[PDB]
Amino acid sequence: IQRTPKIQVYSRHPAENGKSNFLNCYVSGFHPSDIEVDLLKNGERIEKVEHSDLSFSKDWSFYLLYYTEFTPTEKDEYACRVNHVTLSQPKIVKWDRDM
Amino acid sequence: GSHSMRYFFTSVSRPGRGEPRFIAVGYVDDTQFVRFDSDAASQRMEPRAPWIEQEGPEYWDGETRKVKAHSQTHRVDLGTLRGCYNQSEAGSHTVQRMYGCDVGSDWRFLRGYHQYAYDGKDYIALKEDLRSWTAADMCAQTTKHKWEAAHVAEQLRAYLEGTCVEWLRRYLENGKETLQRTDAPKTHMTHHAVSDHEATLRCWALSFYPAEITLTWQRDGEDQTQDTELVETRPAGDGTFQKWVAVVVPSGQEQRYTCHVQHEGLPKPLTLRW
Ligand SMILES: CC(C)C[C@H](N)C(=O)O
Numbered sequence: 011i012q013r014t015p016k017i018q019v020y021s022r023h024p025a026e027n028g029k030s031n032f033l034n035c036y037v038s039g040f041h042p043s044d045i046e047v048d049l050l051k052n053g054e055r056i057e058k059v060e061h062s063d064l065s066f067s068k069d070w071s072f073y074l075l076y077y078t079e080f081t082p083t084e085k086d087e088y089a090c091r092v093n094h095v096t097l098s099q100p101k102i103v104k105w106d107r108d109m
Numbered sequence: 110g111s112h113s114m115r116y117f118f119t120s121v122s123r124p125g126r127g128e129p130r131f132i133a134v135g136y137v138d139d140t141q142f143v144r145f146d147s148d149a150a151s152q153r154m155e156p157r158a159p160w161i162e163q164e165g166p167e168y169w170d171g172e173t174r175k176v177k178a179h180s181q182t183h184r185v186d187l188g189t190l191r192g193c194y195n196q197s198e199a200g201s202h203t204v205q206r207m208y209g210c211d212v213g214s215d216w217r218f219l220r221g222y223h224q225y226a227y228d229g230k231d232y233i234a235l236k237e238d239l240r241s242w243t244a245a246d247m248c249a250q251t252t253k254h255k256w257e258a259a260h261v262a263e264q265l266r267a268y269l270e271g272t273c274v275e276w277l278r279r280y281l282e283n284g285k286e287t288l289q290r291t292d293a294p295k296t297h298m299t300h301h302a303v304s305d306h307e308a309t310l311r312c313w314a315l316s317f318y319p320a321e322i323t324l325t326w327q328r329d330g331e332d333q334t335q336d337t338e339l340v341e342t343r344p345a346g347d348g349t350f351q352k353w354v355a356v357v358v359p360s361g362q363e364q365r366y367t368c369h370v371q372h373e374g375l376p377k378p379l380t381l382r383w
């Protein structure tokens with residue numbers, strides 16, 4: 011009855027140090043709709059994160075985009091942390107500029 | 110090409126106090142244009158695309174009336190469903206509804222849809238002829254009989270074949286600068302080594318609209334699916350979409366492999382090679 015989220019973590023635009031960009035965490039395929047999604051900078055929760063309006067796919071599973079403005083640098087590590095009723099432990103997906 | 114207008118509705122019961130959480134969104138093609146959220150302070154249907162802001166206060170009054178009516182129907186339904194399935198008052202449950210219309214390239218009616226799920230599973234749907242229903246179990250069959258007695262299909266068919274298409278045509282005209290514009294994918298290829306025997310080639314498609322796209326790999330001109338990975342199409346957040354496809358190849362044999370990209374914005378498919 012319960013379907014676990016798929017997670018992709020990526021930038022809005024091509025990733026270049028020093029330029030204002032946007033960090034996205036796209037969560038999809040999940041049911042029920044209650045979900046916790048955090049964006050992390052060097053392991054710490056980013057405060058000003060927005061998300062899209064809840065919608066769903068043909069199979070009734072839900073999808074959301076979570077996003078925040080960020081200026082990438084060489085040292086800063088970013089990730090998405092997701093909790094859902096299907097997960098025993100929060101799941102962390104690192105941002106990899108190549109995916 | 111073809112176009113669509115679709116509305117999506119989600120209600121989630123809240124056992125111990127008050128009415129369900131209700132969220133409604135409307136799309137033209139892959140562009141969201143309205144929302145309603147029961148938790149928001151406005152208690153209005155709200156614009157989410159610049160081209161719907163044109164519409165006058167009478168539009169916003171009528172859409173707000175209609176969407177609040179849908180929220181009440183879902184409230185009652187969550188009650189009916191809990192009773193039919195003999196469920197307790199303790200758990201939260203979900204109803205979802207989607208409806209709308211497809212038109213072809215001539216903007217004439219192609220297909221209409223109206224369907225309904227409980228706890229994420231099919232419950233009842235209008236068939237393609239818009240004259241009959243698909244009920245998944247005996248609870249839904251009781252709903253079907255009810256809706257047959259009240260000629261519900263007839264009312265929905267009139268909306269889906271007529272009114273729905275009329276609104277879609279209006280929006281496509283009003284929003285033409287974006288809704289009728291195709292943004293072809295911006296493509297490139299990356300290369301990474303795992304070991305010195307194995308390499309990964311990744312074909313990227315960025316900044317495209319609408320979301321439909323096909324990415325395929327060939328080896329020496331023949332389709333290859335083994336040793337490939339295709340990610341789900343994802344929103345960029347600026348209204349465009351992104352996708353990639355990768356293949357693992359023997360190091361030194363990268364020239365054998367081509368990626369092929371098909372999209373409505375490309376007059377002929379694109380071929381990329383490392
Ligand atoms: C509130 C909206 C989903 C109503 C839709 N415009 C209709 O007339 O059905």
Ligand code: NA
Nearest residue numbers: 135143154172
């Ligand atoms: Na509307």
